[PDB]
Coordinates of all heavy atoms in Angstrom, one line a residue:
Chain C
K12 N -1.8 -52.7 -18.6 CA -1.0 -51.5 -18.4 C 0.4 -51.8 -18.9 O 1.1 -52.6 -18.3 CB -1.0 -51.2 -16.9 CG -2.3 -50.9 -16.3 CD -2.2 -50.1 -14.9 CE -1.7 -51.1 -13.8 NZ -2.8 -52.0 -13.4
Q13 N 0.7 -51.1 -20.0 CA 2.1 -51.1 -20.5 C 2.5 -49.6 -20.7 O 2.4 -49.1 -21.8 CB 2.2 -51.8 -21.8 CG 3.6 -52.1 -22.3 CD 4.1 -51.1 -23.2 OE1 3.4 -50.5 -24.0 NE2 5.4 -50.8 -23.1
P14 N 3.1 -49.0 -19.6 CA 3.2 -47.5 -19.7 C 4.2 -47.1 -20.8 O 5.2 -47.7 -21.0 CB 3.7 -47.2 -18.3 CG 3.4 -48.4 -17.4 CD 3.6 -49.5 -18.4
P15 N 3.9 -45.9 -21.4 CA 2.7 -45.1 -21.2 C 1.5 -45.5 -22.0 O 0.4 -44.9 -21.8 CB 3.1 -43.7 -21.7 CG 4.6 -43.8 -21.9 CD 4.9 -45.2 -22.3
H16 N 1.5 -46.6 -22.7 CA 0.4 -47.0 -23.6 C -0.6 -47.9 -22.8 O -0.3 -48.9 -22.3 CB 1.0 -47.8 -24.8 CG 1.9 -47.0 -25.7 ND1 3.2 -46.8 -25.4 CD2 1.6 -46.3 -26.8 CE1 3.7 -46.1 -26.3 NE2 2.8 -45.8 -27.2
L17 N -1.8 -47.4 -22.8 CA -2.9 -48.1 -22.1 C -4.0 -48.6 -23.0 O -4.2 -48.0 -24.1 CB -3.5 -47.2 -21.0 CG -2.9 -47.1 -19.6 CD1 -3.0 -48.4 -18.9 CD2 -1.4 -46.6 -19.7
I18 N -4.6 -49.7 -22.7 CA -5.7 -50.3 -23.5 C -6.9 -50.3 -22.6 O -6.9 -50.7 -21.4 CB -5.3 -51.6 -24.0 CG1 -6.3 -52.1 -25.1 CG2 -5.0 -52.7 -22.9 CD1 -6.3 -51.3 -26.3
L19 N -8.0 -49.8 -23.1 CA -9.3 -49.6 -22.3 C -10.4 -50.4 -23.1 O -10.9 -49.9 -24.1 CB -9.6 -48.1 -22.2 CG -10.7 -47.8 -21.2 CD1 -10.2 -48.1 -19.8 CD2 -11.0 -46.3 -21.2
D20 N -10.7 -51.5 -22.5 CA -11.7 -52.4 -23.1 C -13.1 -51.8 -22.7 O -13.6 -52.1 -21.6 CB -11.6 -53.8 -22.7 CG -12.4 -54.8 -23.5 OD1 -11.8 -55.2 -24.6 OD2 -13.5 -55.1 -23.2
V21 N -13.7 -51.0 -23.6 CA -15.0 -50.5 -23.4 C -16.0 -51.3 -24.2 O -16.1 -51.2 -25.4 CB -15.1 -49.0 -23.8 CG1 -16.5 -48.4 -23.5 CG2 -14.0 -48.2 -23.1
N22 N -16.7 -52.2 -23.5 CA -17.7 -53.1 -24.1 C -17.2 -54.0 -25.2 O -17.7 -54.0 -26.3 CB -18.9 -52.3 -24.6 CG -19.5 -51.4 -23.5 OD1 -19.4 -50.2 -23.5 ND2 -20.2 -52.1 -22.6
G23 N -16.1 -54.7 -24.9 CA -15.5 -55.7 -25.8 C -14.4 -55.2 -26.6 O -13.6 -56.0 -27.1
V24 N -14.3 -53.9 -26.9 CA -13.3 -53.3 -27.7 C -12.3 -52.5 -26.9 O -12.7 -51.6 -26.1 CB -13.9 -52.5 -28.9 CG1 -14.7 -51.4 -28.4 CG2 -12.8 -52.0 -29.8
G25 N -11.0 -52.7 -27.1 CA -10.0 -52.0 -26.4 C -9.6 -50.7 -27.1 O -9.6 -50.7 -28.4
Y26 N -9.2 -49.7 -26.4 CA -8.9 -48.4 -27.0 C -7.5 -48.0 -26.7 O -7.0 -48.0 -25.5 CB -9.9 -47.3 -26.4 CG -11.3 -47.4 -26.9 CD1 -12.3 -46.8 -26.2 CD2 -11.6 -48.2 -28.0 CE1 -13.6 -46.9 -26.7 CE2 -12.9 -48.4 -28.4 CZ -13.9 -47.7 -27.7 OH -15.2 -47.8 -28.1
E27 N -6.7 -47.8 -27.8 CA -5.3 -47.4 -27.7 C -5.2 -45.9 -27.2 O -5.5 -45.0 -27.9 CB -4.6 -47.6 -29.0 CG -4.1 -49.0 -29.2 CD -3.0 -49.4 -28.3 OE1 -2.1 -48.5 -28.0 OE2 -2.9 -50.6 -27.9
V28 N -4.8 -45.7 -25.9 CA -4.8 -44.4 -25.3 C -3.5 -44.4 -24.5 O -3.1 -45.4 -23.8 CB -6.0 -44.1 -24.5 CG1 -6.3 -45.2 -23.4 CG2 -6.0 -42.7 -23.9
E29 N -2.8 -43.3 -24.4 CA -1.7 -43.1 -23.5 C -2.1 -42.1 -22.4 O -2.9 -41.3 -22.6 CB -0.4 -42.6 -24.2 CG -0.5 -41.3 -24.9 CD -0.2 -40.1 -23.9 OE1 0.4 -40.4 -22.9 OE2 -0.6 -39.0 -24.2
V30 N -1.5 -42.3 -21.2 CA -1.7 -41.4 -20.1 C -0.3 -40.9 -19.6 O 0.6 -41.7 -19.8 CB -2.6 -42.0 -19.0 CG1 -4.0 -42.3 -19.5 CG2 -1.9 -43.2 -18.4
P31 N -0.2 -39.7 -19.1 CA 1.1 -39.3 -18.5 C 1.4 -40.1 -17.3 O 0.6 -40.7 -16.6 CB 0.9 -37.8 -18.2 CG -0.4 -37.4 -18.9 CD -1.2 -38.7 -19.0
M32 N 2.7 -40.1 -16.9 CA 3.2 -40.8 -15.7 C 2.6 -40.2 -14.5 O 2.3 -41.0 -13.5 CB 4.7 -40.7 -15.7 CG 5.3 -39.3 -15.6 SD 5.4 -38.5 -14.0 CE 6.6 -39.4 -13.2
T33 N 2.2 -38.9 -14.5 CA 1.4 -38.4 -13.4 C 0.1 -39.1 -13.3 O -0.4 -39.5 -12.2 CB 1.2 -36.9 -13.6 OG1 0.5 -36.7 -14.8 CG2 2.5 -36.2 -13.7
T34 N -0.6 -39.3 -14.4 CA -1.8 -40.2 -14.5 C -1.5 -41.6 -14.2 O -2.4 -42.3 -13.7 CB -2.5 -40.0 -15.8 OG1 -2.5 -38.6 -16.1 CG2 -3.9 -40.5 -15.7
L35 N -0.3 -42.1 -14.5 CA 0.1 -43.4 -14.0 C 0.0 -43.5 -12.5 O -0.3 -44.6 -11.9 CB 1.5 -43.8 -14.5 CG 1.8 -44.6 -15.8 CD1 1.2 -45.9 -15.8 CD2 1.4 -43.8 -17.0
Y36 N 0.3 -42.4 -11.8 CA 0.1 -42.4 -10.3 C -1.4 -42.3 -9.9 O -1.6 -42.2 -8.7 CB 0.9 -41.2 -9.7 CG 2.4 -41.3 -9.7 CD1 3.1 -40.6 -10.6 CD2 3.0 -42.1 -8.8 CE1 4.5 -40.7 -10.6 CE2 4.4 -42.3 -8.8 CZ 5.2 -41.6 -9.7 OH 6.5 -41.7 -9.8
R37 N -2.3 -42.3 -10.9 CA -3.7 -42.4 -10.5 C -4.5 -43.5 -11.2 O -5.7 -43.5 -11.0 CB -4.4 -41.0 -10.8 CG -4.3 -40.0 -9.7 CD -3.1 -39.1 -9.8 NE -3.3 -38.2 -11.0 CZ -2.3 -37.4 -11.5 NH1 -1.1 -37.3 -10.9 NH2 -2.6 -36.6 -12.5
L38 N -3.9 -44.3 -12.0 CA -4.6 -45.4 -12.6 C -5.0 -46.5 -11.6 O -4.3 -46.8 -10.7 CB -3.8 -46.0 -13.8 CG -3.4 -45.1 -15.0 CD1 -2.5 -45.8 -15.9 CD2 -4.7 -44.7 -15.7
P39 N -6.1 -47.2 -11.9 CA -6.5 -48.3 -11.1 C -5.8 -49.6 -11.5 O -4.9 -49.5 -12.4 CB -8.0 -48.4 -11.3 CG -8.4 -47.2 -12.1 CD -7.2 -46.8 -12.8
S40 N -6.1 -50.7 -10.9 CA -5.4 -52.0 -11.3 C -6.0 -52.5 -12.6 O -7.0 -52.0 -13.2 CB -5.6 -53.0 -10.1 OG -5.0 -54.2 -10.5

Side-chain angles (χ1 to χ4, degrees):
Chain C
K12 297 198 288 288
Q13 192 266 325
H16 297 83
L17 273 296
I18 191 67
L19 193 63
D20 197 86
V21 183
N22 303 108
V24 61
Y26 291 164
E27 278 290 326
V28 58
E29 62 86 20
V30 298
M32 61 80 71
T33 63
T34 315
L35 270 296
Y36 293 102
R37 275 91 69 187
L38 294 174
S40 174

